[PDB]
Design an enzyme around this catalytic site. Structure first.
Site, PDB file in Angstrom:
ATOM      1  N   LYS A   1      36.933 -45.805   7.232  1.00 54.44           N
ATOM      2  CA  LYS A   1      35.990 -46.001   8.324  1.00 54.44           C
ATOM      3  C   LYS A   1      36.318 -45.098   9.515  1.00 54.44           C
ATOM      4  O   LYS A   1      35.815 -45.351  10.603  1.00 54.44           O
ATOM      5  CB  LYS A   1      35.984 -47.484   8.700  1.00 54.44           C
ATOM      6  CG  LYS A   1      35.596 -48.415   7.549  1.00 54.44           C
ATOM      7  CD  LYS A   1      35.537 -49.861   7.927  1.00 54.44           C
ATOM      8  CE  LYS A   1      35.362 -50.786   6.741  1.00 54.44           C
ATOM      9  NZ  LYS A   1      33.963 -50.774   6.241  1.00 54.44           N
TER      10      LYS A   1
ATOM     11  N   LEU B   1      62.661 -42.087   8.762  1.00 59.29           N
ATOM     12  CA  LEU B   1      62.869 -43.420   8.187  1.00 59.29           C
ATOM     13  C   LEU B   1      61.605 -43.898   7.460  1.00 59.29           C
ATOM     14  O   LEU B   1      60.437 -43.588   7.801  1.00 59.29           O
ATOM     15  CB  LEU B   1      63.266 -44.404   9.289  1.00 59.29           C
ATOM     16  CG  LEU B   1      64.517 -44.032  10.088  1.00 59.29           C
ATOM     17  CD1 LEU B   1      64.754 -44.954  11.272  1.00 59.29           C
ATOM     18  CD2 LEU B   1      65.752 -44.031   9.197  1.00 59.29           C
TER      19      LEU B   1
HETATM   20  C1  LIG Z   1      51.816 -34.544  20.868  1.00 54.46           C
HETATM   21  C2  LIG Z   1      51.736 -35.910  20.178  1.00 54.46           C
HETATM   22  C3  LIG Z   1      50.967 -35.818  18.855  1.00 54.46           C
HETATM   23  C4  LIG Z   1      51.052 -37.213  18.210  1.00 54.46           C
HETATM   24  C5  LIG Z   1      50.309 -37.245  16.823  1.00 54.46           C
HETATM   25  C6  LIG Z   1      50.770 -36.236  15.784  1.00 54.46           C
HETATM   26  C7  LIG Z   1      49.939 -36.356  14.469  1.00 54.46           C
HETATM   27  C8  LIG Z   1      50.364 -37.604  13.632  1.00 54.46           C
HETATM   28  C9  LIG Z   1      49.494 -37.654  12.374  1.00 54.46           C
HETATM   29  C10 LIG Z   1      49.832 -38.967  11.600  1.00 54.46           C
HETATM   30  C11 LIG Z   1      51.218 -38.858  10.839  1.00 54.46           C
HETATM   31  C12 LIG Z   1      51.438 -40.152  10.012  1.00 54.46           C
HETATM   32  C13 LIG Z   1      52.749 -40.094   9.185  1.00 54.46           C
HETATM   33  C14 LIG Z   1      52.791 -41.405   8.384  1.00 54.46           C
HETATM   34  O1  LIG Z   1      52.903 -42.555   8.860  1.00 54.46           O
HETATM   35  S1  LIG Z   1      52.523 -41.143   6.692  1.00 54.46           S
HETATM   36  C15 LIG Z   1      52.200 -42.773   6.042  1.00 54.46           C
HETATM   37  C16 LIG Z   1      50.705 -43.075   6.165  1.00 54.46           C
HETATM   38  N1  LIG Z   1      50.430 -44.499   5.766  1.00 54.46           N
HETATM   39  C17 LIG Z   1      50.004 -44.875   4.590  1.00 54.46           C
HETATM   40  O2  LIG Z   1      49.846 -44.093   3.639  1.00 54.46           O
HETATM   41  C18 LIG Z   1      49.799 -46.384   4.504  1.00 54.46           C
HETATM   42  C19 LIG Z   1      48.631 -46.670   3.530  1.00 54.46           C
HETATM   43  N2  LIG Z   1      47.377 -46.020   3.964  1.00 54.46           N
HETATM   44  C20 LIG Z   1      46.734 -46.295   5.081  1.00 54.46           C
HETATM   45  O3  LIG Z   1      47.119 -47.121   5.894  1.00 54.46           O
HETATM   46  C21 LIG Z   1      45.519 -45.462   5.335  1.00 54.46           C
HETATM   47  O4  LIG Z   1      45.010 -44.894   4.112  1.00 54.46           O
HETATM   48  C22 LIG Z   1      45.667 -44.299   6.363  1.00 54.46           C
HETATM   49  C23 LIG Z   1      45.976 -44.852   7.758  1.00 54.46           C
HETATM   50  C24 LIG Z   1      46.864 -43.373   5.988  1.00 54.46           C
HETATM   51  C25 LIG Z   1      44.422 -43.411   6.448  1.00 54.46           C
HETATM   52  O5  LIG Z   1      43.373 -44.307   6.824  1.00 54.46           O
HETATM   53  P1  LIG Z   1      42.015 -44.289   5.944  1.00 54.46           P
HETATM   54  O6  LIG Z   1      42.357 -43.979   4.499  1.00 54.46           O
HETATM   55  O7  LIG Z   1      41.371 -45.563   6.259  1.00 54.46           O
HETATM   56  O8  LIG Z   1      41.172 -43.027   6.395  1.00 54.46           O
HETATM   57  P2  LIG Z   1      40.213 -42.814   7.731  1.00 54.46           P
HETATM   58  O9  LIG Z   1      38.729 -42.862   7.319  1.00 54.46           O
HETATM   59  O10 LIG Z   1      40.625 -43.763   8.701  1.00 54.46           O
HETATM   60  O11 LIG Z   1      40.630 -41.351   8.164  1.00 54.46           O
HETATM   61  C26 LIG Z   1      40.479 -40.212   7.377  1.00 54.46           C
HETATM   62  C27 LIG Z   1      41.220 -39.050   7.979  1.00 54.46           C
HETATM   63  O12 LIG Z   1      42.642 -39.390   7.981  1.00 54.46           O
HETATM   64  C28 LIG Z   1      43.356 -38.324   7.441  1.00 54.46           C
HETATM   65  N3  LIG Z   1      44.558 -38.890   6.844  1.00 54.46           N
HETATM   66  C29 LIG Z   1      44.668 -39.658   5.745  1.00 54.46           C
HETATM   67  N4  LIG Z   1      45.974 -39.987   5.597  1.00 54.46           N
HETATM   68  C30 LIG Z   1      46.699 -39.392   6.583  1.00 54.46           C
HETATM   69  C31 LIG Z   1      48.073 -39.384   6.901  1.00 54.46           C
HETATM   70  N5  LIG Z   1      49.026 -40.036   6.127  1.00 54.46           N
HETATM   71  N6  LIG Z   1      48.454 -38.773   8.015  1.00 54.46           N
HETATM   72  C32 LIG Z   1      47.534 -38.072   8.748  1.00 54.46           C
HETATM   73  N7  LIG Z   1      46.214 -38.032   8.476  1.00 54.46           N
HETATM   74  C33 LIG Z   1      45.798 -38.737   7.386  1.00 54.46           C
HETATM   75  C34 LIG Z   1      42.406 -37.811   6.376  1.00 54.46           C
HETATM   76  O13 LIG Z   1      42.825 -36.547   5.946  1.00 54.46           O
HETATM   77  C35 LIG Z   1      41.096 -37.797   7.178  1.00 54.46           C
HETATM   78  O14 LIG Z   1      40.995 -36.674   8.057  1.00 54.46           O
HETATM   79  P3  LIG Z   1      40.066 -35.449   7.616  1.00 54.46           P
HETATM   80  O15 LIG Z   1      40.678 -34.979   6.316  1.00 54.46           O
HETATM   81  O16 LIG Z   1      38.679 -36.061   7.458  1.00 54.46           O
HETATM   82  O17 LIG Z   1      40.211 -34.353   8.659  1.00 54.46           O
HETATM   83  C1  LIG Z   2      56.595 -39.866   0.557  1.00 53.86           C
HETATM   84  C2  LIG Z   2      56.107 -40.892  -0.428  1.00 53.86           C
HETATM   85  N1  LIG Z   2      57.137 -41.034  -1.448  1.00 53.86           N
HETATM   86  C3  LIG Z   2      57.012 -40.297  -2.696  1.00 53.86           C
HETATM   87  C4  LIG Z   2      58.226 -41.818  -1.168  1.00 53.86           C
HETATM   88  N2  LIG Z   2      58.374 -42.278   0.077  1.00 53.86           N
HETATM   89  C5  LIG Z   2      59.458 -42.994   0.468  1.00 53.86           C
HETATM   90  N3  LIG Z   2      59.460 -43.393   1.789  1.00 53.86           N
HETATM   91  C6  LIG Z   2      60.521 -44.150   2.405  1.00 53.86           C
HETATM   92  C7  LIG Z   2      58.262 -42.940   2.510  1.00 53.86           C
HETATM   93  C8  LIG Z   2      57.646 -44.092   3.316  1.00 53.86           C
HETATM   94  C9  LIG Z   2      56.445 -43.576   4.077  1.00 53.86           C
HETATM   95  N4  LIG Z   2      56.792 -42.304   4.760  1.00 53.86           N
HETATM   96  C10 LIG Z   2      57.845 -42.426   5.740  1.00 53.86           C
HETATM   97  C11 LIG Z   2      57.420 -41.303   3.900  1.00 53.86           C
HETATM   98  C12 LIG Z   2      58.760 -41.936   3.507  1.00 53.86           C
HETATM   99  N5  LIG Z   2      60.434 -43.341  -0.399  1.00 53.86           N
HETATM  100  C13 LIG Z   2      60.355 -42.934  -1.721  1.00 53.86           C
HETATM  101  C14 LIG Z   2      61.328 -43.184  -2.706  1.00 53.86           C
HETATM  102  C15 LIG Z   2      61.172 -42.660  -4.034  1.00 53.86           C
HETATM  103  C16 LIG Z   2      60.089 -41.881  -4.495  1.00 53.86           C
HETATM  104  S1  LIG Z   2      60.041 -41.395  -6.095  1.00 53.86           S
HETATM  105  O1  LIG Z   2      61.352 -41.650  -6.378  1.00 53.86           O
HETATM  106  O2  LIG Z   2      59.602 -40.031  -6.211  1.00 53.86           O
HETATM  107  N6  LIG Z   2      59.008 -42.363  -6.833  1.00 53.86           N
HETATM  108  C17 LIG Z   2      58.644 -43.453  -6.136  1.00 53.86           C
HETATM  109  C18 LIG Z   2      59.580 -44.582  -5.961  1.00 53.86           C
HETATM  110  C19 LIG Z   2      60.972 -44.666  -6.510  1.00 53.86           C
HETATM  111  N7  LIG Z   2      58.889 -45.466  -5.195  1.00 53.86           N
HETATM  112  N8  LIG Z   2      57.593 -44.919  -4.897  1.00 53.86           N
HETATM  113  C20 LIG Z   2      56.780 -45.855  -4.062  1.00 53.86           C
HETATM  114  C21 LIG Z   2      57.362 -43.694  -5.428  1.00 53.86           C
HETATM  115  C22 LIG Z   2      56.150 -42.802  -5.357  1.00 53.86           C
HETATM  116  C23 LIG Z   2      59.113 -41.616  -3.529  1.00 53.86           C
HETATM  117  C24 LIG Z   2      59.229 -42.109  -2.192  1.00 53.86           C
HETATM  118 MG   LIG Z   3      39.433 -46.422   8.521  1.00 54.08          MG
END
Ligand SMILES: CCCCCCCCCCCCCC(=O)SCCNC(=O)CCNC(=O)[C@H](O)C(C)(C)COP(=O)(O)OP(=O)(O)OC[C@H]1O[C@@H](n2cnc3c(N)ncnc32)[C@H](O)[C@@H]1OP(=O)(O)O
Ligand SMILES: CCN(C)c1nc(N(C)C2CCN(C)CC2)nc2ccc(S(=O)(=O)Nc3c(C)nn(C)c3C)cc12
Ligand SMILES: [Mg+2]
Length: 411
Positions: free
Chosen positions: A168, A411
């Site tokens: 969304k 982390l």
């Molecule tokens: C100077 C200070 C700057 C501070 C900020 C620096 C930047 C920090 C950036 C964040 C660093 C985070 C590091 C971590 O924590 S990485 C861990 C991310 N968390 C997860 O994977 C948890 C499970 N997933 C979710 O909670 C949701 O699927 C998330 C929240 C990830 C996306 O929510 P949703 O699936 O409901 O989608 P949308 O409709 O709202 O939004 C779609 C847009 O979001 C872009 N998208 C998808 N995933 C990511 C992602 N991991 N980083 C950056 N962007 C991401 C996507 O390409 C698209 O953009 P565009 O392709 O259309 O252009």
């Molecule tokens: C980056 C995503 N990712 C591949 C992994 N992320 C993190 N985190 C701590 C993430 C957490 C989110 N964010 C900070 C990045 C750090 N730990 C992992 C530990 C192991 C491995 S794997 O060993 O290649 N296979 C695997 C296992 C053993 N569990 N899961 C779930 C997978 C795919 C992958 C990951």
């Molecule tokens: Mg959303």
């Protein structure tokens, strides 16, 4: 193809990445006064919330959002379960800025819908060694050196949108609001990591894992019994024997870190991290916070001989929820943190990490191929995983580097 990321100050393609020659900003220079005073607009049924991370209730709310909605594996089998005590540790380091923890709540009932966290980090992020050499060849040393000094920037982690609110475009809103709050404090760069591929990483590394409790890992389908273990009369007995470890550490001078160790650990770590192109700079307070042992969270041991600390290692705990197993509910993983070896080979230091983790009930030890982690993979029976961690900057042009030139653990 990227309606949000195309609008942001990041490298847009590999092509563009490949041409970057010096560290430096991407965006127009701005000041605090240019940045909007008021929070970004949001739908009238939602509201911004800044959690108090020293309120147990607040930590708990964040904890449940992540428990139920944070990163899974690709097959719906595991979901990370960062603990409340871990989250307090990770999100409240010295001099943290409460305003950098950004949440969205449903106005009606204060249900937490989304979260993103920023913490301060002091990072070396100037032009890498291999590119400084190129700069000298061209007579451009001063240009290449401009941003050598460590910079006080933002580290972003824990981005999460509730499963019922996915797709969304809420994540962009969160990211824009975190950016505003960071820029209102006169900080213009961030570093973040993700498994997914976004525009555009400056480094990428494979994950590695080392089995500590193979019986359990096989039961939960983290691991299988590998095909070669078939030609054997009895697969599992052989698997346990392969991964067996000593009951006790082998380095005689090994003990847990205590507060009095902080200055020596700081010195040996900072000397070691200097060898990498991108890496953190830690104060005594930051060494204390990130490395002194905390029950259930972070575990740190030093090698002391002749009353001097010569080596150390640390690991931290992130369990995962196991979805649908009738025998186990949790995977207990240990992650290699910071370390430094001056007296012994790194493989001998990290064997003691595996021994300690195993004795403390951990199931597997994980790491990414950053630091000098590749140097002990084969001897210590780590195997490559399916996953990769990608490193990114916001508002920072940076030449591509190998993950063995990265020293920041996230982390
Ligand atoms: C100077 C200070 C700057 C501070 C900020 C620096 C930047 C920090 C950036 C964040 C660093 C985070 C590091 C971590 O924590 S990485 C861990 C991310 N968390 C997860 O994977 C948890 C499970 N997933 C979710 O909670 C949701 O699927 C998330 C929240 C990830 C996306 O929510 P949703 O699936 O409901 O989608 P949308 O409709 O709202 O939004 C779609 C847009 O979001 C872009 N998208 C998808 N995933 C990511 C992602 N991991 N980083 C950056 N962007 C991401 C996507 O390409 C698209 O953009 P565009 O392709 O259309 O252009
Ligand atoms: C980056 C995503 N990712 C591949 C992994 N992320 C993190 N985190 C701590 C993430 C957490 C989110 N964010 C900070 C990045 C750090 N730990 C992992 C530990 C192991 C491995 S794997 O060993 O290649 N296979 C695997 C296992 C053993 N569990 N899961 C779930 C997978 C795919 C992958 C990951
Ligand atoms: Mg959303």
């Amino acid at each position: 193809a990227h309606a949000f990321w195309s609008t942001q100050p990041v490298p847009q393609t590999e092509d563009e990445t490949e041409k970057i020659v010096f560290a430096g900003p991407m965006d127009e220079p701005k000041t605090v006064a240019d940045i909007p005073e008021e929070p970004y607009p949001i739908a009238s049924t939602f509201e911004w919330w800044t959690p108090n991370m020293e309120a147990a209730d607040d930590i708990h709310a964040i904890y449940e959002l992540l428990r139920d909605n944070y990163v899974e594996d690709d097959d719906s089998m595991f979901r990370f379960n960062y603990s409340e005590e871990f989250l307090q540790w990770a999100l409240c380091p010295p001099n943290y800025i409460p305003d950098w923890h950004v949440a969205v709540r449903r106005k009606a009932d204060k249900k937490l819908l989304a979260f993103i966290a920023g913490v301060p980090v002091t990072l070396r992020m100037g032009t890498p060694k291999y590119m400084k050499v190129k700069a000298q060849e061209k007579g451009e040393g001063e240009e290449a050196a401009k941003y050598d000094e460590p910079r006080h920037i933002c580290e972003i982690n824990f981005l999460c949108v509730h499963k019922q609110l996915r797709e969304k475009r809420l994540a962009p809103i969160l990211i824009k609001e975190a950016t505003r709050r960071v820029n209102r404090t006169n900080v213009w760069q961030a570093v973040y990591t993700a498994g997914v591929l976004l525009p555009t990483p400056y480094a990428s590394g494979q994950y590695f894992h080392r089995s500590l409790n193979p019986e359990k890992l096989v039961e939960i389908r983290f691991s299988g019994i590998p095909a070669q273990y078939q030609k054997f009369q009895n697969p599992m007995a052989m698997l346990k024997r392969n991964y067996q470890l000593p009951s006790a550490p082998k380095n005689s001078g090994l003990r847990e870190m205590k507060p009095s160790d902080v200055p020596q650990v700081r010195r040996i770590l900072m000397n070691y991290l200097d060898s990498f192109d991108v890496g953190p700079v830690f104060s005594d307070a930051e060494i204390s916070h990130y490395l002194l042992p905390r029950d259930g969270v972070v575990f740190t041991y030093v090698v002391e001989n002749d009353k001097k600390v010569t080596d150390f290692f640390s690991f931290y705990r992130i369990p995962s929820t196991v979805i649908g197993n009738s025998n186990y509910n949790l995977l207990n993983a240990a992650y290699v943190h910071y370390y430094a070896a001056t007296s012994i080979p790194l493989h001998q230091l990290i064997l003691d990490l595996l021994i300690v983790a195993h004795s403390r009930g951990f199931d597997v030890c994980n790491m990414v191929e950053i630091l000098d982690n590749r140097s002990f993979v084969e001897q210590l029976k780590f195997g490559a995983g399916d996953g990769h961690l990608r490193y990114y900057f916001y508002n920072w042009a940076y030449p591509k580097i190998k993950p063995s030139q990265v020293a920041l653990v996230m982390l």
